[PDB]
Amino acid sequence: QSDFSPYIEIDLPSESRIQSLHKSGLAAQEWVACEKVHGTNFGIYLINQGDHEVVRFAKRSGIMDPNENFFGYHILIDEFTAQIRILNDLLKQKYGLSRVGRLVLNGELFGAKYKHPLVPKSEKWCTLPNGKKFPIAGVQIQREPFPQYSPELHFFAFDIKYSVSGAEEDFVLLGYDEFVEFSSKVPNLLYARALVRGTLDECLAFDVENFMTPLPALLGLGNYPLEGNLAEGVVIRHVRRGDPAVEKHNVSTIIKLRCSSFMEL
Ligand SMILES: Nc1ncnc2c1ncn2[C@@H]1O[C@H](COP(=O)(O)OP(=O)(O)OP(=O)(O)O)[C@@H](O)[C@H]1O
Ligand SMILES: [Mg+2]
Secondary structure, three states, X not given: OOOOOOOOOOOOOOHHHHHHHHHOOHHHOOEEEEEEOOOEEEEEEEEEEOOEEEEEEEEOOEEOOOOOOOOOHHXXXXXXXXXXXXXXXXXXXXXXXXXXXXXXXXXXXXXXXXOOOOOOOOOOEEEOOOOOEEEHHHOOOOOOOOOOOEEEEEEEEEEEEEEOOOOHHHEEEOOHHHHHHHHHOOOOOEEOOXXXXXXXXXXXXXXXXXXXXXXXXXXXXXXOOOOOOEOOEEEEEEOOOOOHHHHOOOOOOEEEEEOHHHHHO
């Protein structure tokens, strides 16, 4: 697991966090709110090993053996592999890097549930390296009645970091604008996009209670609405989260808000 980098949990806004964000000056700077997707944590890794490299996939708790069946994600490996190679090439070219020890594209694996009679369940079957196959129609990432996104499996990117040396302490996290710029150039990559942008308080004013997930319509299902299909919530973050000048204040610059309807499930 030496190549694995755990992603994070995200807190609801506490009194001490909010006070510190104001006192530090960070609250007055630029923040975004993006959709919080209810799937399972996923990471796509590209690891440099000198003149060769390897693609690996992680769940919440670590990089997986290639024959671990995990919600049918093998159906997306060819896509992920093409995507992560493109992202690495973009980063190397733009940043003048001969080598990137470790590139980590974190996001949410989601979908494979959409209970509308005009939306057939997936007919797709994944295949593992050992030849075993599993139906996407049998995948149940989450049991909750909302949010529901799509009958197919998808990946929602929400962070990109790279370590030139490969060492954990040398990771550089893309800021929001750079994250969007690069992600927008990776073909067919779905990624977190700002629902609102402004001060911390402007983002905190986002109406999560009535926020219907926009993903079904983005994924072809605009004509097949599900009643009460609220998004889980939002993640709010400083647009330069990870930058040393932000991090020097020693205050976390990521928080979440959830809708009450979701919390009650
Ligand atoms: N836009 C997003 N930005 C960051 N994390 C997101 C986003 N959308 C979904 N997530 C997920 O939210 C998780 C953090 O939220 P939180 O601390 O509430 O954990 P959780 O969602 O309850 O955990 P679980 O993975 O078991 O559902 C992340 O680890 C990530 O998997
Ligand atoms: Mg979750």
